[PDB]
Write a protein that binds this ligand. Structure first.
Ligand SMILES: *[C@@H]1O[C@H](CO)[C@@H](O[C@@H]2O[C@H](CO)[C@@H](O[C@@H]3O[C@H](CO[C@H]4O[C@H](CO[C@H]5O[C@H](CO)[C@@H](O)[C@H](O)[C@@H]5O)[C@@H](O)[C@H](O[C@H]5O[C@H](CO)[C@@H](O)[C@H](O)[C@@H]5O)[C@@H]4O)[C@@H](O)[C@H](O)[C@@H]3O)[C@H](O)[C@H]2NC(C)=O)[C@H](O)[C@H]1NC(C)=O
Ligand SMILES: *[C@@H]1O[C@H](CO)[C@@H](O[C@@H]2O[C@H](CO)[C@@H](O[C@@H]3O[C@H](CO[C@H]4O[C@H](CO[C@H]5O[C@H](CO)[C@@H](O)[C@H](O)[C@@H]5O)[C@@H](O)[C@H](O[C@H]5O[C@H](CO)[C@@H](O)[C@H](O)[C@@H]5O)[C@@H]4O)[C@@H](O)[C@H](O)[C@@H]3O)[C@H](O)[C@H]2NC(C)=O)[C@H](O)[C@H]1NC(C)=O
Ligand SMILES: [Zn+2]
Ligand SMILES: [Zn+2]
Lengths: 160, 160
């Protein structure tokens, strides 16, 4: 169900979390467009289980991650080639931050075997317009837009 | 000092931290316009000591707080009448979030007697253009622009 909250101060621990089908993910939309009426920034809290990954994707917005707990590897592909290509692998750890250049293909992986990875994520121009890649070899022109994204599907249908 | 860095993964524990002369404040720009090249979002990490208050201010941007540690009181006035008016005073605590509507005059007060309040603050349209009120009866047209704000001064001067 779509959970909307017009309240000013909200307890994040009482905002409903779900994997939405992404195995090993736990997502909460802390302050968003469809759930709370944001227009310029939207904030997520996500936990990713040991060894799990976000899909390979891009989005036309800025995106900033702040690592609250755990560690992992950020996989970055090319925006200059016609496809992402074999990715650069950049380790990250607790209390680091990283900004994804607008539109770059990337993937976040909990490469740690021992503990959960928890990140606060912020995007501009919400809600998110995510294009999914099946692999680093897939051309940018073939990536598929999945809008609404899984955590917006309920409110997007509800708004109709 | 102005510490520029566009490095993709950055360690928050090593970034410059200062009160910038604001008693009881501790500030780090985690991801910002002038320091790091952001264009649409900017993230601050701030610690506010017991009993301290931010100035009463407004800024024409969205702004979302997430409370990492501690508790406090949010004071909010209106942007539609000629002055802010007697403010709403809403308690907040660890793991809560609040978003300030565009241009609402507000104040964040660490009303706890003993613990530090630590918040992540996210803003749109950076850097911040903050207008300061001396009290809740000061008319909106009289509020004073302080730009650049103290944590942007050094990098603002260096980017001329
Ligand atoms: C502010 O409040 C925040 C909200 O409460 C809080 O953050 C929450 O903190 C809790 C406590 O640590 C976290 O809970 C932890 O979640 C992780 C990660 O979870 C997900 O992955 C698991 C593990 O998975 C794999 O193996 C299982 C076998 O069990 C398979 O099924 C699976 O396919 C994988 O191979 C998975 O089971 C989870 O799934 C279920 O749960 C989701 C949602 O809960 C449902 O949608 C789903 O259908 C089913 O119920 C899920 O995908 C887990 O690994 C830990 O053991 C523990 O549960 C929350 O994740 C975390 N929330 C977020 C959004 O981060 C903050 O910590 C708090 N902060 C402060 C400052 O106080
Ligand atoms: C990710 O990394 C982050 C960065 O390391 C980290 O966050 C930092 O965490 C540390 C450790 O907990 C915090 O340090 C604590 O800071 C508090 C608050 O400090 C400020 O207030 C004090 C107290 O002020 C009042 O009392 C004094 C008298 O003692 C009076 O003078 C004053 O007027 C008030 O009445 C004040 O002394 C502090 O000032 C000094 O320090 C600043 C630098 O911060 C100088 O600029 C200043 O000139 C002067 O030397 C300051 O105003 C302090 O009370 C604690 O004792 C301790 O120092 C950091 O604040 C915090 N940083 C931020 C930005 O939040 C994260 O926790 C880490 N996260 C993870 C997950 O690991
Ligand atoms: Zn992304
Ligand atoms: Zn503010």
């Amino acid at each position: 169900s779509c959970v909307r909250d017009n309240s000013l101060v909200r307890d994040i621990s009482q905002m409903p979390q779900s994997s939405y089908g992404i195995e090993g993910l736990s997502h909460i939309t802390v302050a968003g467009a469809l759930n709370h009426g944001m227009k310029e920034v939207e904030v997520w809290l996500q936990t990713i289980s040991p060894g799990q990954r976000t899909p390979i994707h891009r989005h036309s917005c800025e995106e900033v991650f702040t690592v609250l707990k755990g560690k992992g590897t950020l996989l970055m592909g090319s925006s200059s080639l016609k496809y992402p290509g074999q990715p650069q692998e950049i380790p990250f750890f607790q209390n680091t931050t990283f900004s994804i250049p607008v539109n770059d293909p990337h993937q976040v992986w909990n490469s740690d075997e021992h503990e959960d990875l928890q990140v606060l994520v912020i995007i501009s121009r919400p809600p998110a317009k995510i294009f999914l890649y099946d692999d680093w070899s897939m051309p940018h022109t073939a990536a598929v837009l999945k809008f609404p994204f899984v955590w917006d599907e309920d409110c997007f249908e509800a708004a109709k």
